[PDB]
Structures are given as structure tokens and as C-alpha cells.
Design a protein around this ligand. Sequence first.
Ligand SMILES: Nc1ncnc2c1ncn2[C@@H]1O[C@H](COP(=O)(O)O)[C@@H](O)[C@H]1O
Ligand SMILES: Nc1ncnc2c1ncn2[C@@H]1O[C@H](COP(=O)(O)O)[C@@H](O)[C@H]1O
Lengths: 177, 177
Amino acid sequence: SELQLVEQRIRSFPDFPTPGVVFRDISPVLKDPASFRAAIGLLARHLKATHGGRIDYIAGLDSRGFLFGPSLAQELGLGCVLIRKQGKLPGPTLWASYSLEYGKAELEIQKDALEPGQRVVVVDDLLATGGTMNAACELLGRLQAEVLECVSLVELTSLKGREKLAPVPFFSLLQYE
Amino acid sequence: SELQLVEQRIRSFPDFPTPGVVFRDISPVLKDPASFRAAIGLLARHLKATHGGRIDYIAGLDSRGFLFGPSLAQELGLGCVLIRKQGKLPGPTLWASYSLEYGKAELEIQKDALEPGQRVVVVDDLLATGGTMNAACELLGRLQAEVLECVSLVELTSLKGREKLAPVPFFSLLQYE
Ligand SMILES: Nc1ncnc2c1ncn2[C@@H]1O[C@H](COP(=O)(O)O)[C@@H](O)[C@H]1O
Ligand SMILES: Nc1ncnc2c1ncn2[C@@H]1O[C@H](COP(=O)(O)O)[C@@H](O)[C@H]1O
């Protein structure tokens, strides 16, 4: 199956970047053409079956979300907008600087990236605490854009990222502790 | 034409990130589905006509190169390997830390990213001084990989990035001063 091709392309690294943390690496997905295609296809088919043609843009998150954003957008015949780490984008920007318990979620977006009312789906490689995607949703909301859903390849369920994103819908391909 | 669709989707910002520097933003290319597709198509057709089927992988550069790497690889039916900013990748890595006159080129790659003899094409959004791509080429060389060519959407010719990359071939879609 398609999901199998993604399932077998996740590599785990203990104690990275800090002790006690298991890093989930999506590199083998990118390196395997069939796996990357399967991952994009699964995400696209979910979004199309869920939102139909009401999605205006895909928003990819700096930096690993950039790996999936464009391809997912292209599959849906949509454009891709950028949400970057702070200090990276030119022109007027909105900032979202969050200080959570175990890290910082600090993003930015150009003020002219979206028009009010436009509907967007956010994509990153992995959802953990949800601090990053929540910060992205805040930026989009302040542009008066509508966030239809957030999606990722990997979800760490024990970190309760889904509850944090609520009521914004979320979907992941693979779930780990 | 296809090139026209890319030509009309580059935005310039004066004095970013520092005074005297004109920032070339490829964001409109990503936001326009036809433009992004045209850009990928032009790069792919060049690489296929130049290297045939001798390319094993595409290497995308953190972070804006991640926007084009996967799609370019998929178009050529190839996998995409990652070259990241330092401290981002898990496992054993090689580092390339360069201090040029007007900036730093500091990248890293996993030691198991490539096998000796494998042939790779490097992609980023823009070539300036060439310090970044040269650092990438160094990393690949130390893995005993062969760099067939480096490609980008935009090239700033007055900064002489091409001469720096020599004898490694280079190709860009758009050239500015
Ligand atoms: N255990 C992990 N393995 C790989 N990436 C992670 C991990 N935990 C958090 N991240 C990254 O952190 C960002 C989101 O985390 P969070 O804000 O906690 O949901 C994304 O860039 C994720 O890829
Ligand atoms: N004028 C510019 N506009 C947009 N990106 C730039 C510019 N100059 C350098 N860069 C970025 O710097 C990196 C390569 O620069 P360089 O190492 O000097 O060839 C890439 O990430 C480029 O996108």
C-alpha cells in the first residue's frame, strides 16, 4: 500500500538534539522517490476528500515543511505560501514569538502573503507539542486567512499537539508515542 | 514561454537584509502553480539533456533549496538528499564551515547520505558569491560523491559565483547583476 511506503522510511535517532528525545528523521522518505510520491499522494487525497476545492493555498513551514509544501500544492494544483523563521523574509512581516516550556516557536510571514478570507492548509514534517503550527495558525489568522487544516507526515501523540491546535483540524500519516 | 512564467515571478527588495543589498524573492514563483511547474520543468529538461540518466540524486540546500529539490528530483524520477545548516541533522555528519569576506557558509551532511561514486546535482534558489554551493560541493566530495552540476533559479553574475564553482558546471534560469 501507499502508507507502507512511508511507514518503512522513517528513521529514529535517540538523544537528539538533546538527551531523552527521539528524533524522527524523514530523510529516507525524501531519498526514496516512491516513498515521497506516496506521502504527497496520501496527503493530497485526504485534503481533496475533506475540503474539495475550497483550499486556496498550501503553507509550508521553515524548514522541513518546505520539503513537502510545494509538491503537495502542485498535486492539488495550488500555489504555496511561505512561513519562515524570523528575520528571513523581506518586506513588512507579522511575527509570532512563543516561549513554551521545552522550546521556542518563533515564525514570521509577509503581510501581503494572503488576502482576507483566503483558505489555507498548513504543512510541516512532524507535529510534536504543536507550538510551531499553532504559531503559524496565529499568523494566518492575523492576516484574516482561514486555516482549514494542519497536516504532517509524523505525529507524536503523547505531546498532545492535536489538542493544542483545536479547533483547527489535524491529520497525520504516521503516529508515534 | 516557460521561462517567461518564471521571469515575471521574481520580486526585488532593496536594502535587505543589509543596506546596499537587493534581495531577490522567489516567493511569487512558489505562489504561482504554473510558474513553479515551469521552473521545475526547465531545470529538469536541462539536466536530462545534459546528463541523461547518470544522475543518482538531487541535493537540496537548507532552506530555500528545499523548495525546489524534492520537486526537481520527482520530475527526474530521483530521490532527494539533504544538505542542512549545521546542528540540524541527526547522526554522524561532515561539516563545512567557511568564512568568506561578506558572510559565512556553514553547512552539514549525514555521513551515510551518499555512497562513493554516486552522482549528484545540487540545487538552491539563488547563486551569489558561490560560497554556499561551494561548501556543499566540498561536503559531497568528502563523501567521494561526484557533483555533476549545480543549478539555481537566479544568478547574480557580478558576484562571480560561476568562477568559484569551476570546474563544477553551473546553470541558472535567470541572471541579474
Ligand atoms: N522528536 C522529533 N523528531 C524530529 N523533528 C521534531 C521532533 N520534535 C519536534 N520536531 C520539530 O519541531 C517542529 C514542531 O514541533 P512542535 O512546535 O513542538 O509541535 C517541527 O519543525 C518538527 O519537525
Ligand atoms: N541578493 C540575494 N537575494 C536573495 N537570496 C540571496 C541573495 N544573496 C545571497 N542569497 C542566499 O545566499 C545563499 C547563497 O549565497 P552565496 O553563498 O553567496 O552564493 C542562498 O541561500 C541564497 O538564496
